[PDB]
């Protein structure tokens with residue numbers, strides 16, 4: 349049918365690619381997706397690499413189908429070879445694995461390229477976040493008991509990313525507007541599709557329609573251990589409304605944001621006991637060197653009512 353097919357490394361349904369090979373944006377074509385996909389699978393399987401590298405030269409002219417099929421076939425043949433070896437005394441790769449950071453960037457990238465049909469329909473109302481978000485996840489030091497929500501989910505790329513790098517129960521995304529929430533519906537599928545295509549595990553997640561300020565979410569925000577929220581352009585109305593939901597939150601949970609929900613040099617005194625800063629720490633996170641008003645940093649808030657307790661331990665016994 350004048351097309352290309354890649355064979356899944358765990359005998360899942362192959363990836364179909366129509367010719368000519370679609371270009372998605374100024375820096376992303378499906379041609380390189382392929383090349384990437386291949387060398388990423390070569391990564392999981394040292395054997396496939398062994399069967400490929402010692403023969404392949406990696407590079408081909410992407411303009412020619414006669415040259416792209418040349419590679420795909422080579423790859424597809426190497427796959428069968430390994431699958432045969434999978435019938436021998438040797439074990440296959442462990443199926444219950446999470447993606448390595450490197451791999452996952454590529455995966456989410458595919459999910460974007462394939463689901464975002466019109467890369468302009470949202471980018472008009474919106475203004476690599478991956479590397480950034482990755483940093484935050486190491487900073488969050490997430491434990492198997494936490495719950496995560498992205499407030500204002502968008503198409504939920506982060507929702508997905510957290511779901512693959514951490515290890516917890518149903519993680520959630522909340523999106524009000526129909527457009528990005530609609531894209532999220534197919535973003536759900538492709539992600540789950542490609543994950544199976546690669547044979548990698550991901551925590552349960554759910555990309556939802558709704559407003560986070562609404563009555564129902566008041567409750568849920570309080571139950572959620574980890575909160576990512578990009579609040580750069582939020583405006584005082586909504587900013588205050590969040591602080592109240594964050595108030596109810598359990599002890600020790602975290603909030604990551606572009607803008608601080610509590611001042612940085614916050615000392616507790618007379619006319620500030622009502623303020624949210626009383627129940628949380630706010631340490632500043634330094635930005636990754638390759639990501640973009642140039643001067644920007646980030647803020648990690650941790651629920652700490654010992655901050656408060658100390659002030660009420662101090663009103664008893666003035667040492668000065």
Ligand SMILES: CC(C)N(C[C@H]1O[C@@H](n2cnc3c(N)ncnc32)[C@H](O)[C@@H]1O)[C@H]1C[C@@H](CCc2nc3cc(C(C)(C)C)ccc3[nH]2)C1
Pocket residue numbers: 477480481498499500501502503504505506522523524525528558559560561576577578579580604605606646
């Ligand atoms: C500016 C943020 C909040 N957001 C805008 C979206 O918020 C949505 N939104 C507005 N108010 C809404 C409402 N009350 N309920 C439902 N959703 C609403 C709105 O529809 C819009 O699509 C965009 C971020 C993008 C989602 C992916 C994402 N990038 C993140 C970056 C970060 C950093 C800054 C800490 C690194 C953290 C989390 C991220 N998630 C969508």
